Ligand binder design. Sequence first.
Ligand SMILES: O=C(O)CC[C@@H]1NC(=O)NC1=O
Ligand SMILES: [Fe+3]
Length: 402
Amino acid sequence: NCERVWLNVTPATLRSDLADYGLLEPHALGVHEGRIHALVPMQDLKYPAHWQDMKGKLVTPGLIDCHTHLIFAGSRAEEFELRQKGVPYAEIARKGGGIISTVRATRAASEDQLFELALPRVKSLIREGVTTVEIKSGYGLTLEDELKMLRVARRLGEALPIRVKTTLLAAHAVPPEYRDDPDSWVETICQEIIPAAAEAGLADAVDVFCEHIGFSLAQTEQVYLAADQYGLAVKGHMDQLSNLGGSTLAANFGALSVDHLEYLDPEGIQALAHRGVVATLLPTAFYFLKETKLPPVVALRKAGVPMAVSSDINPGTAPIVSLRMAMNMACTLFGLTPVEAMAGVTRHAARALGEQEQLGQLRVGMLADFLVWNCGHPAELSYLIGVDQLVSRVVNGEETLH
Ligand SMILES: O=C(O)CC[C@@H]1NC(=O)NC1=O
Ligand SMILES: [Fe+3]
């Protein structure tokens, strides 16, 4: 008893209780009020005519990119070129290069301009099969500019057939105006930005860049405390350049996830395992930054810590708008299997966004966010990159290709 039905689909359920991809024999998938209402093997059936026959095509949950900075203005391309040519970073920086140039360009960009700049980026993720994307602020570094980014994020979720989770990342770096008083900036975030963002219902979570050239463990704790007071979930950019113990702090605050982790240690891994925190791998940033210190994948696996994989789309360290390329890199650079990568962009990605109960698996009762592909096996999703392969892209039970 459901409005729409997809006949003859070969489901890669990605169910948490099923091995590998949770692939099953051909089934019939029916949706009711935006949710998967029923999953019945075809042998138990023998339509109406509005029922769509997929003729055995593979179906999977919609992909999820749980860590992006896709909203931004300006371009760091010229700066990159100069570096490749051999110009010292000091010269580039003294002339205002680096993350600050993105901040100035983004502050200067109007809300309408950021929206128009982000549209084409989100459309590329959409055609790859991404149905839920997380977008962070962090390039505003002022109360008005940080919320401006969050508003653009909400706008994208309303204008396009894709779910958007917003994350306040005001603690991405210390703005120029607070250069000599970092703690003053932290107070602003805690006493003004988080409260204003929460009051407007603009933030689903709060993030922090905890590092030596970022925010200290103490300053990071101040932020999580404020988030806590407004009932906002927390997460953080941890152990990317060094270990300050940030992952353990985040775990103690019930973080949804910790991201990067190149320098994560055993103690931290133990904390993550115990608090059920998701470890988010960002292979693209690792690639582009030409890093050599690999995240402790083997240890994370041994401890059973779920690992999500994300594109980390951002103008500074990962200018690649592709979730699937990230999956390919997680396998090639971090040694993940195609099945770990797939769970990394479904089941585990959902959990990293606090949506473990609603998305990421083809189970009765969960939201109807699924994809019908023209390729034969799910392993191919992490393998062949750059080709449009969607036959059907369903979000909340409704077709979105046309
Ligand atoms: O440089 C940028 O624009 C963002 C870099 C990005 N943010 C962070 O905390 N780590 C990264 O790699
Ligand atoms: Fe990031």
